[PDB]
Structures are given as C-alpha cells and as structure tokens.
Design an enzyme around this catalytic site. Sequence first.
Site, PDB file in Angstrom:
ATOM      1  N   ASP A   1     -26.696 -30.784  66.302  1.00  0.00           N
ATOM      2  CA  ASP A   1     -26.486 -32.233  66.074  1.00  0.00           C
ATOM      3  C   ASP A   1     -26.972 -32.689  64.701  1.00  0.00           C
ATOM      4  O   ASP A   1     -28.044 -33.281  64.643  1.00  0.00           O
ATOM      5  CB  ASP A   1     -27.238 -33.012  67.147  1.00  0.00           C
ATOM      6  CG  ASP A   1     -26.834 -34.463  67.197  1.00  0.00           C
ATOM      7  OD1 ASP A   1     -25.802 -34.798  66.600  1.00  0.00           O
ATOM      8  OD2 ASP A   1     -27.559 -35.263  67.821  1.00  0.00           O
TER       9      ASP A   1
ATOM     10  N   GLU B   1     -25.035 -41.593  61.216  1.00  0.00           N
ATOM     11  CA  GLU B   1     -24.339 -41.629  62.526  1.00  0.00           C
ATOM     12  C   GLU B   1     -25.371 -41.993  63.581  1.00  0.00           C
ATOM     13  O   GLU B   1     -25.073 -42.815  64.447  1.00  0.00           O
ATOM     14  CB  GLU B   1     -23.745 -40.266  62.872  1.00  0.00           C
ATOM     15  CG  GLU B   1     -22.952 -40.241  64.164  1.00  0.00           C
ATOM     16  CD  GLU B   1     -23.777 -40.154  65.435  1.00  0.00           C
ATOM     17  OE1 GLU B   1     -24.910 -39.652  65.371  1.00  0.00           O
ATOM     18  OE2 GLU B   1     -23.287 -40.602  66.478  1.00  0.00           O
ATOM     19  N   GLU B   2     -26.557 -41.411  63.459  1.00  0.00           N
ATOM     20  CA  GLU B   2     -27.577 -41.598  64.516  1.00  0.00           C
ATOM     21  C   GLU B   2     -28.079 -43.040  64.546  1.00  0.00           C
ATOM     22  O   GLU B   2     -28.208 -43.659  63.491  1.00  0.00           O
ATOM     23  CB  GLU B   2     -28.691 -40.559  64.371  1.00  0.00           C
ATOM     24  CG  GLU B   2     -28.264 -39.149  64.747  1.00  0.00           C
ATOM     25  CD  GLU B   2     -28.100 -38.874  66.233  1.00  0.00           C
ATOM     26  OE1 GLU B   2     -28.161 -39.831  67.017  1.00  0.00           O
ATOM     27  OE2 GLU B   2     -27.906 -37.701  66.605  1.00  0.00           O
TER      28      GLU B   2
ATOM     29  N   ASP C   1     -18.783 -32.471  66.653  1.00  0.00           N
ATOM     30  CA  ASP C   1     -20.126 -32.938  66.971  1.00  0.00           C
ATOM     31  C   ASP C   1     -20.674 -32.119  68.127  1.00  0.00           C
ATOM     32  O   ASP C   1     -19.918 -31.638  68.976  1.00  0.00           O
ATOM     33  CB  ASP C   1     -20.107 -34.442  67.321  1.00  0.00           C
ATOM     34  CG  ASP C   1     -21.486 -35.128  67.164  1.00  0.00           C
ATOM     35  OD1 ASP C   1     -22.499 -34.451  66.877  1.00  0.00           O
ATOM     36  OD2 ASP C   1     -21.548 -36.362  67.318  1.00  0.00           O
TER      37      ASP C   1
ATOM     38  N   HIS D   1     -30.965 -34.252  71.667  1.00  0.00           N
ATOM     39  CA  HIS D   1     -32.064 -35.212  71.389  1.00  0.00           C
ATOM     40  C   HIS D   1     -33.369 -34.690  72.002  1.00  0.00           C
ATOM     41  O   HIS D   1     -34.121 -35.497  72.552  1.00  0.00           O
ATOM     42  CB  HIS D   1     -31.604 -36.625  71.775  1.00  0.00           C
ATOM     43  CG  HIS D   1     -30.562 -37.151  70.846  1.00  0.00           C
ATOM     44  ND1 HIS D   1     -30.311 -38.497  70.698  1.00  0.00           N
ATOM     45  CD2 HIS D   1     -29.722 -36.518  70.002  1.00  0.00           C
ATOM     46  CE1 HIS D   1     -29.357 -38.669  69.808  1.00  0.00           C
ATOM     47  NE2 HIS D   1     -28.975 -37.471  69.368  1.00  0.00           N
TER      48      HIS D   1
END
Lengths: 334, 334
Positions: free
Chosen positions: A110, A149-150, A197, A291
Amino acid sequence: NLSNADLEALTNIQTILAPLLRPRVPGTPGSELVRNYIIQFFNSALPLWTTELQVSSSKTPVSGSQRIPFVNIIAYRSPPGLNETDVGWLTLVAHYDSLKDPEGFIGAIDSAAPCSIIMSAVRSIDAALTRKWDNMEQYGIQVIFTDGEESFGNTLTANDGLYGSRSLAAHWAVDKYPSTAKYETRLSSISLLVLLDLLGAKNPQIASYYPVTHFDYQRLAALESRLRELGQLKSSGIHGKSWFVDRTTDVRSLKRQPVEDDQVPFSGLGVKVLHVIDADPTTGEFPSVWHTPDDDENHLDFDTIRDWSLLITAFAAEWLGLQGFMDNHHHHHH
Amino acid sequence: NLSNADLEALTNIQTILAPLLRPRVPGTPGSELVRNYIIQFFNSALPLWTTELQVSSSKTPVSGSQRIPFVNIIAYRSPPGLNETDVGWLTLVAHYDSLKDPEGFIGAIDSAAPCSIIMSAVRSIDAALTRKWDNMEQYGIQVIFTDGEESFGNTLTANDGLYGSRSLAAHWAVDKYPSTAKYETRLSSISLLVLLDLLGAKNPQIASYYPVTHFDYQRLAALESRLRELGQLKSSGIHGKSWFVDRTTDVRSLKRQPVEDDQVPFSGLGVKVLHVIDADPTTGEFPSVWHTPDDDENHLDFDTIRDWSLLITAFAAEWLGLQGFMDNHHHHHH
C-alpha cells in the site's frame, strides 16, 4: 492481440522496490526522497520519457492551518511526429505516499509494490515501443504516481484523502486543448486509466467495478489465464484459481460497489477507469496486513509481485499493439 | 432545530413550474427561454440574491464536431457584512436541461418539478432569512440549476452526460480563495449539496446513498414525519408510509450503490452530497414514466409536489437555523 511467442518474449523488481519501502508521508523528507528516486529511475532507465510534477497544497484534518504539499509524479512517452494533443493515453496509476499513523508505516502493498510493478512493466515494454514506432497509431503510454491518496483524519470526511488525484483530475479537466486538437482536455485524453492498489500479498482477488471497462478487465483476465497456461506464473500452478473473480460475469450482471480510491475523482469527471485492487468479493475486506505494521517487506510475496509485473507488462503490450515487436532476438548476428 | 409553530408558519408551485415544462435541450432556443425565465424569477422575486452563469462547451456523441454549450445557473444569498469567501453554502441542485430523444420530451419529474420545488422553497424562506440576519452564523444559501445532465448517446460512455456538473465542479475546484479565507476553494465552500431528481410522481421512495450525509437524510426524514403528524402533507395521511426508506438504517449498515447523476462529479471531488432521487430500494428502477413521453404535466401528482416543496422549505429552514423567524404575524398592528 498478443501471440504465445509475444508472451514468451516477456533492475529486478526487488531492486526497483527497495528504495520505495521507507516512510513517505506527504510534505516530509521521506516523500522528497522517494519522489526523486522515482523521477531518477525514469530519467536514467527511460530517457525517452518526459517527466513532470503537478503540485498543490491543502489543509488536512491533522495539519491545523498549515497547508501540506501534494506532488503527483507524471511520466509519459508519445509516438514521435504526432502532436501530443492528438494522443490518447493508456494511463497506469498507483499512489506513492504512505499513511502517517502509525509512525513509520511502510505500506509495502500500500502501495510501494504497485508502484514498482508499474515501473517494471513500462521499463519492460519501452524497447518494443521504440521498435513498433520505428516501423510506422495515435496512442501513448503514461504513468501517474499520485500523492496524498491516504486520509489523515480519524473521522470519515468527504474532503479528506485523495488529495493528489483530486488536484490532478481537476487541473487536467480544465487544461483546455486547442480547438484543432483531437482531444478536448488533457483529462479527456486519457483513454484508459488502470489504478493498481493493495498488491503484493498472496492470492489476490480482483473484482470488476466499472461496466464501461469490463471488457478491459476481461482482456486482463484472459492474459492472466494464458500466462498460467504457458507455465509463466511463479505464484500459481497450471491449475491455480484465477485472480479475476468476475472474468465470466456479463457486463449487465455487474453490481459491486466501487472502492473509494484514486480512480473516483477521474471517474466522476468522465474518465474510463479500471480498478485493480485486492479485496474480498463477498465482504469487501482488504488484505489482513492492511493499515497494520505487518504491511512490510517481510509479508510481501515476491512471486506474486513478479507475476503482477509480468501481467501488467502483457496488458500494456497488448493494449499498445506491440504484437511481433516483443522479441528482438537476431540469429547469426552480433 | 424547528418547532411545530415554525412548521405551521410554513407564485403557486403550478405558476413557477408552468414556464419550465417545455423542451429545453441544451444549445436550443428552448434552453435559452427556460434559462432566462429562471434568472428572471430570481431577479424579480428574490432581488437580494446574486445570479450568475457558468459556461462551457463540449462535443457530445450526437453533435459530430460541433461544440454544444452548457450553461449552469447559479443563484445565492450570503449573510451581510461577511466576506463571501468565509461563507459555507447550503446548496440545492436540480438539472434544468431535457432529454433530446424523443423529440419534444418535457421531463416533468425529470427534472422540471424538482427545479420548481427548489425555486418555491427558497422563495418561501427568503423573508425569514432577512429576519434572522437583521437580528444578528457564517452560512449562506445557494441553488444550482445544472445543464447537460442528460446523456445524448446510445452507448454507455464514461464522458457522456453530466456536462454541466462536471464543468461546474471542475472550475469551482480550481477557483482558489485567498489564503486568508476560511475556505480553500469555491468548491470546498459547499457545506452540503442536496440534489433533487425524478420528483413529482406519487409515493416516491428515497434511499440514503452517502453515509457521510446520512445524518442530514435522517433530519430530512424527521421533518417529513413531523409534518405528517401535523397533518400538513397533502399526498399522505397521518398513517401514510414514510418516503425515506432508510430512516432507521444505521450509518454503518448502509450499502446501496449510488445512482450516477449530477452529485457524482462534486462527490468525487470531496463535497458532502445528499441525493434525493425516487428509485425502488430493491431493484433500482426509476418511476414508470422515466424517459417516456408519459413524463408530462398530466402525470404529475401536484399534492406530492406541494409536499416536496413544503419539506424542502422545512429542511432549508432547519439547516440555516431559522427557528422563531418563520412567523412574522403581528397582533393589533397594521
């Protein structure tokens, strides 16, 4: 349309990826290091490509009143002797920023591996691209590595996250071409956007999220299966299950909700979008390491990453019409 | 928070709608007539409002190489003595263009009634707005009537349709405010966008499509129910079924796919969006008259339109905090 010879014809992935696998939160020195690495990769290995940055700044839920910079990296190659404003772009995208919280998060799947996958694939087709253009049609190749993006905030907030892609789609949508041009905006010149992704973990499941690009999804699936039949996949055997769980679904039976990501700004503005993301088809859940401090190099499955690189290479080569140009072997010749 | 007195306190709808119910395909003289009507309605009945056009042109699947114009109508009122760039906007939207094929299509619910509903509701709150501001907080009211929502092509095509909203969201997203401003772009100054579509038919079913605005959906539902309890709805009795089929769903159980419409460009760029569209909750099907010559004045249910006007008035009044300002009756006073 690619032949089995073309497929057999298809800076190791680990070499390209290693420099990406550090913290790269936007605005920090990690970001600048990863960004200059990527640009230098294109400048040295792909000199025929033009590189460019797109820069914006915006506040985030955690920056108070400070404006964080967001720097998209764009690199492209166009057929020579063509007005660039007449070129349709196959566009490959992944995000190169990393989650801020927890401190030192790396984001291996990621999305460092996806970025390496794109860099590896375009590197592998550059020579065939030269070969096919030397022979000569109005289509080019483009990569975007998006920043921001995050999301940064704890709450769910409509304007948090996707900072780079929102800025880039916005400015390209108002970059109005000459009235004599085949395309009306820089945004509208994107023929197909492929966003990678959450890739690099074992046994990915890739659903088809956009009917208007289901055909491209099916082309991608077809290539996967052919490379599986050729014995060219390292992560799956000749009887392995296909990653592409919608390969047989009819375009009119597709009903999966899209995952919010870098493709949403482009799609909402009218770009055809193909979202290659690993998520459970039934629950929507992402890979287990998502995550988590476990999304690190040691949980990457590099056979799967090599397979992804091979498949994206094959997809781009089929799309740009490189059949018969992938093999440059010459017999009885030095 | 509105009281029952406030609700009881809440240019008939038919008068406002009549001039809209003609062909208004973009670029044609019908469009110019409907557009100047709408602008003149605001100029005469709502003189405190500023009106503005946003203009773009683009080719469509049926215009060959000709560029069709698309003209969004914007009208707004801000609290006085406030820098307009510090104002958050409640924004009410519907599309005023009409489907080209079949020839002479009117689009009564699609979307002339929705437009009339917005014009009626903002007309009804203007006086209370003056009353509450005379007394004085950084929030205004805005309407957008979008052009080119309807697609023109037979095939499904990512860049066909939503011409007005794509252009408007794009240009507002790059309309960068002073760095001293509370908001960063004109787009980002939209606090809530409420899009009305396919309204005016009997017994509508309104689902909740965006978790981030489910609370607003629930506020809207609450108002509906209170007005039903007050006996103020003309299309439903005190025991009628609520239009808002997700009023009890938990924000975390919402799983309906959004309907592609004018809110998609704004949402994909980070605007909070509330989509009030009549569609079956289970199948996704739109009203029976949809895209049929039967979507005409004679199939409108005007009790339902009056109810919608009353409900949107109540929603805007609750949102702008007009409690205690809706009734201006004065006893023993001429």
